[PDB]
Amino acid sequence: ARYTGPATRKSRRLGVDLVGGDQSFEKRPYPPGQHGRARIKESEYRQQLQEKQKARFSYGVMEKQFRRYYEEANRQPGKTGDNLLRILESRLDNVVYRAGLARTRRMARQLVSHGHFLVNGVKVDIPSYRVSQYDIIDVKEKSLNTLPFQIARETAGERPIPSWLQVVGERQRILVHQLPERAQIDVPLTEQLIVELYSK
Amino acid sequence: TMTDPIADFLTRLRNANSAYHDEVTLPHSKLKANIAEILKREGYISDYRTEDARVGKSLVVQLKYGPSRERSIAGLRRVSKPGLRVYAKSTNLPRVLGGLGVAIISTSSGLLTDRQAARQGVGGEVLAYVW
Amino acid sequence: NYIERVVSINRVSKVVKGGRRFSFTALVIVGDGKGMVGVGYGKAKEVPAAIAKGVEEARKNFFRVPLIGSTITHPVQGEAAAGVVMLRPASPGTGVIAGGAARAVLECAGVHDILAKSLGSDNAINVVHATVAALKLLQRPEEVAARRGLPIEDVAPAGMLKARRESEALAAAAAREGSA
Amino acid sequence: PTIQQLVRKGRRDKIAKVKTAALKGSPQRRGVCTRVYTTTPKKPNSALRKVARVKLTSQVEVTAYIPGEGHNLQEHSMVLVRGGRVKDLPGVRYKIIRGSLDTQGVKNRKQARSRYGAKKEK
RNA sequence: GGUGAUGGCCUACCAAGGCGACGACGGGUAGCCGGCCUGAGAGGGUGACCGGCCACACUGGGACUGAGAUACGGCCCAGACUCC
RNA sequence: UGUAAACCUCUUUCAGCACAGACGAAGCGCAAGUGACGGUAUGUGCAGAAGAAGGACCGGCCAACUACGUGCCAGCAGCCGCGGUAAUACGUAGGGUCCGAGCGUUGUCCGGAAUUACUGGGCGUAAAGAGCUCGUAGGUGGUUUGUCGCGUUGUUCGUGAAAACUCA
RNA sequence: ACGCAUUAAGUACCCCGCCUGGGGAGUACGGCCGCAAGGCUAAAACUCAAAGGAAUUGACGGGGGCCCGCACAAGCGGCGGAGC
Ligand SMILES: [Mg+2]
Ligand SMILES: [Mg+2]
Ligand SMILES: [Mg+2]
Ligand SMILES: [Mg+2]
Ligand SMILES: [Mg+2]
Ligand SMILES: [Mg+2]
Ligand SMILES: [Mg+2]
Ligand SMILES: [Mg+2]
Ligand SMILES: [Mg+2]
Ligand SMILES: [Mg+2]
Ligand SMILES: [Mg+2]
Numbered sequence A: 001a002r003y004t005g006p007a008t009r010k011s012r013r014l015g016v017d018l019v020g021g022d023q024s025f026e027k028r029p030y031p032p033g034q035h036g037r038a039r040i041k042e043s044e045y046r047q048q049l050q051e052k053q054k055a056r057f058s059y060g061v062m063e064k065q066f067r068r069y070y071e072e073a074n075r076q077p078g079k080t081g082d083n084l085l086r087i088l089e090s091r092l093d094n095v096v097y098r099a100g101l102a103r104t105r106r107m108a109r110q111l112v113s114h115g116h117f118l119v120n121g122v123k124v125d126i127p128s129y130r131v132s133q134y135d136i137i138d139v140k141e142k143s144l145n146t147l148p149f150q151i152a153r154e155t156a157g158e159r160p161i162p163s164w165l166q167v168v169g170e171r172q173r174i175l176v177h178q179l180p181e182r183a184q185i186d187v188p189l190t191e192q193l194i195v196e197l198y199s200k
Numbered sequence B: 001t002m003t004d005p006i007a008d009f010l011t012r013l014r015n016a017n018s019a020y021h022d023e024v025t026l027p028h029s030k031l032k033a034n035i036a037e038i039l040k041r042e043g044y045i046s047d048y049r050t051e052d053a054r055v056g057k058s059l060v061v062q063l064k065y066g067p068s069r070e071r072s073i074a075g076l077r078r079v080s081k082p083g084l085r086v087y088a089k090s091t092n093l094p095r096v097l098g099g100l101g102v103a104i105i106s107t108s109s110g111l112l113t114d115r116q117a118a119r120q121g122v123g124g125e126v127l128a129y130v131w
Numbered sequence C: 001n002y003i004e005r006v007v008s009i010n011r012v013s014k015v016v017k018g019g020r021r022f023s024f025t026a027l028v029i030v031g032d033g034k035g036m037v038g039v040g041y042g043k044a045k046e047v048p049a050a051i052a053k054g055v056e057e058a059r060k061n062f063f064r065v066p067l068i069g070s071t072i073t074h075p076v077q078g079e080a081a082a083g084v085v086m087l088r089p090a091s092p093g094t095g096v097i098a099g100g101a102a103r104a105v106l107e108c109a110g111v112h113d114i115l116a117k118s119l120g121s122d123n124a125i126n127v128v129h130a131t132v133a134a135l136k137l138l139q140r141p142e143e144v145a146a147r148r149g150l151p152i153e154d155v156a157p158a159g160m161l162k163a164r165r166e167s168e169a170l171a172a173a174a175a176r177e178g179s180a
Numbered sequence D: 001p002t003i004q005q006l007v008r009k010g011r012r013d014k015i016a017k018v019k020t021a022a023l024k025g026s027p028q029r030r031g032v033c034t035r036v037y038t039t040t041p042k043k044p045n046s047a048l049r050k051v052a053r054v055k056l057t058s059q060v061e062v063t064a065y066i067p068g069e070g071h072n073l074q075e076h077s078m079v080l081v082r083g084g085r086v087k088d089l090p091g092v093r094y095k096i097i098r099g100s101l102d103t104q105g106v107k108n109r110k111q112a113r114s115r116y117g118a119k120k121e122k
Numbered sequence E: 001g002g003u004g005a006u007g008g009c010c011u012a013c014c015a016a017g018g019c020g021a022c023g024a025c026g027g028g029u030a031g032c033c034g035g036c037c038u039g040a041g042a043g044g045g046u047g048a049c050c051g052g053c054c055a056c057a058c059u060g061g062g063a064c065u066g067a068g069a070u071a072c073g074g075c076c077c078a079g080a081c082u083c084c
Numbered sequence F: 001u002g003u004a005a006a007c008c009u010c011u012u013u014c015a016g017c018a019c020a021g022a023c024g025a026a027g028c029g030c031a032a033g034u035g036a037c038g039g040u041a042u043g044u045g046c047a048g049a050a051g052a053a054g055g056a057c058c059g060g061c062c063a064a065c066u067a068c069g070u071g072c073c074a075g076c077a078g079c080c081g082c083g084g085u086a087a088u089a090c091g092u093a094g095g096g097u098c099c100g101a102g103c104g105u106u107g108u109c110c111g112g113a114a115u116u117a118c119u120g121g122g123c124g125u126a127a128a129g130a131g132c133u134c135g136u137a138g139g140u141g142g143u144u145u146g147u148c149g150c151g152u153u154g155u156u157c158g159u160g161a162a163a164a165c166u167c168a
Numbered sequence G: 001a002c003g004c005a006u007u008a009a010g011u012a013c014c015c016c017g018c019c020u021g022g023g024g025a026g027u028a029c030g031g032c033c034g035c036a037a038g039g040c041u042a043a044a045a046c047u048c049a050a051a052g053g054a055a056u057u058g059a060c061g062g063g064g065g066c067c068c069g070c071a072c073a074a075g076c077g078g079c080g081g082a083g084c
């Protein structure tokens, strides 16, 4: 199941922008609640939980399968933090969101659930696809005729496509080439506290 | 009862390092001589020697200290002792200070350092963890 | 840029003829992020003064711990004060794992991969004392070779030799990036 | 302890101080009430609580604590019992779930409804 | 003498010994193991399923059949249970 | 409370209704045919945001606070402890937190427990050296001269079932 | 921690006794010894969420040294008797 309640509540309580263009946040950064002014006592667990929640709702990932993320990252021989960030950025949802074919990660998930795309010529209608390397992601004719996808493809003029990701032309073919690196990704927050909380 | 000459020698070395001595006198033995071989070639004892005494041959140990008075050997603990004896396989050779230390291993060739044993693939009994 | 982390604000009281007099004492650690550790514990009559004295004490009492890459060199048996603490360098991304005071001091020092496990009498002050003692008990391979009259290749394993080489290259790249 | 002593004697681990003797290792036992009465907690906390003496399928006579605010329990009422300590009552070590068998959850509850077994509003 | 096969498997006679404090025999517990849970680790717990073995077939015994019987729905006897 | 809500556009996965529709069978027959699962899995169409969210916690540990109602009662509760009229700890409300088609309670087992201390405990008083000796068995050995190598590691092929874990 | 500080609690080595929160209780049952008083070996249940160690300041002490006040002693005059 996904989140059906308000989405701006998340940013308001979290104290940082999630989508990026929040007028309501900039109008009132204080987290909701009749006591959004009470001073918050320092707590290492508190901050670890804060970081965990922010990352989880930022990526739309469910709690259990993101624990699965963390354990899988431990399993891989590389460093746990960058392994986790790699495996969570590999999400087809994040791929479409950051390739300019989805305005928001939630909309990418909605479209994938609708099943309007072809991956390597095989129909797929699952959000959490594992986008390997060298792969190719397509979009099919009914998706093309769909209006909002057209708008997104002409609106992909935001923060430019990251290094390993790129779009080749009007058909919007997305292909990944090399290994994303933490420094170039510059995904926000620090994996230190996430790994600490899950190693608790 | 001098029921562990190796332990007594190592205790004398560390105690002399603590008391800031220069020479330590001990009864001489073949095991003492070869262990001195090991430590001197590793560079922990400035130099040993074997002399003659009233009854039996002995040995004197010459240590070094770091240029700023620094102690040469920080800690000394025996591992394989009468009663509790410890051995190791070719793969499970002990690691001391992540390689920064030297563990004295008895292998077929004799007593060689941890790196020598690891490169040769041979193993045996680890004598003392010297740091 | 320096780091200050509140670890333990405590309430104390003293008794004289009229009754009980309450008091405050606090402990705080300061570090630069490259391996400089500073602790300060002080008493005061209220939280702001206590923190001020703690920061002053931390600035006064400093220390420098040579780190390798982004992790400690070898495992440290931190025995002192009343607690027992052991440390183990870690691989990257794993983080610096320990208890409260241990993490306070370590994140102040700036490390990012280490393992620690408090082994009895975890009182924060004694724990921090033991962490500092262990941290100062570390050894630098270059100085070890210098003392033993032995050279770097023969003293230090090839693994950490390559690790130090890569760390040096990364530091040079960072310096070039900053200067440019 | 020297190594020879260790070999001679063997190392004995702690024997577990098992709590909740009644269920004999079970997560649940069913019982029938024998009496309903009241008792006064220890000195630090004074009150008038409601405790029930129940016969168990395991034939053990142990009191149980009555949750909530109102109850419909009269002598000879089949009940369900769970495990839990109680500090105010020294001779009490069991609760009595509400909303099962003949014990229903106290009416007028909407917060923490699940713990006491109450239905929704409509 | 007996067993598909050596052997107190069974019989007769000789000798008094054998097992015992590096725990006999006694008592309570319980199918063993590859494994499952935990733990960095050693280690602790534990034996769900699958699987490798063991033992059981209302309770106690015995034997026939054959290359193959603890013979579950094969046999006989005794007790209990139910029924004609 | 809240971009929440109604609102204007959209796709409508999955359920609903229909069409096509597999393989699971170089398998068997000297026969022409052999599929329960299932007329399902799976594709293609039809109208519709239309059929779809709850549970625990919010005194410190412990990320989540305020007012309303009774005040040593009625009660909470994991330990500390919370009510003797103005409770962030009871109940009600809102608001917030965690989680989520599952959410809590309970109970068994490991952990932190280095709280049975081999790794890796202590013995002055906190719990512990017996009251002190000789000394059997066991446990242990002050030196070098000598072989057999049974303690030992040394390597070569030679066993370690499948299944489970770790790598691709 | 008080403290030990070569006649160690230091740094080691070899062996042996012993302990794992407080009551219960070194007691109940049992075995052994004793002529006995009792001794030796050594339990569980239930209850408590603390008991204990060295040390900091108070407070107090029919504990010590140095100090001061109609505090005591030496004086007058008094109230507690009666009415008011
Ligand atoms: Mg963990
Ligand atoms: Mg010799
Ligand atoms: Mg040892
Ligand atoms: Mg020590
Ligand atoms: Mg000291
Ligand atoms: Mg402790
Ligand atoms: Mg603790
Ligand atoms: Mg014969
Ligand atoms: Mg025989
Ligand atoms: Mg015969
Ligand atoms: Mg059996």
Ligand SMILES: [Mg+2]
Residues within 6 Å of the ligand: none
């Ligand atoms: Mg196993």
Ligand SMILES: [Mg+2]
Residues within 6 Å of the ligand: E039, E040, E041
């Ligand atoms: Mg472990």
Ligand SMILES: [Mg+2]
Residues within 6 Å of the ligand: E042, E043
């Ligand atoms: Mg273990």
Ligand SMILES: [Mg+2]
Residues within 6 Å of the ligand: E047
């Ligand atoms: Mg088993």
Ligand SMILES: [Mg+2]
Residues within 6 Å of the ligand: E051
């Ligand atoms: Mg099988």
Ligand SMILES: [Mg+2]
Residues within 6 Å of the ligand: E051
């Ligand atoms: Mg099986």
Ligand SMILES: [Mg+2]
Residues within 6 Å of the ligand: none
């Ligand atoms: Mg077999």
Ligand SMILES: [Mg+2]
Residues within 6 Å of the ligand: E056
């Ligand atoms: Mg049978």
Ligand SMILES: [Mg+2]
Residues within 6 Å of the ligand: E070, E071
């Ligand atoms: Mg049979």
Ligand SMILES: [Mg+2]
Residues within 6 Å of the ligand: E072, E073
């Ligand atoms: Mg049968």
Ligand SMILES: [Mg+2]
Residues within 6 Å of the ligand: E073
């Ligand atoms: Mg039958």
Ligand SMILES: [Mg+2]
Residues within 6 Å of the ligand: F023
């Ligand atoms: Mg077919």
Ligand SMILES: [Mg+2]
Residues within 6 Å of the ligand: none
């Ligand atoms: Mg065919």
Ligand SMILES: [Mg+2]
Residues within 6 Å of the ligand: none
């Ligand atoms: Mg489909």
Ligand SMILES: [Mg+2]
Residues within 6 Å of the ligand: none
């Ligand atoms: Mg369809």
Ligand SMILES: [Mg+2]
Residues within 6 Å of the ligand: D112, F057
């Ligand atoms: Mg609650």
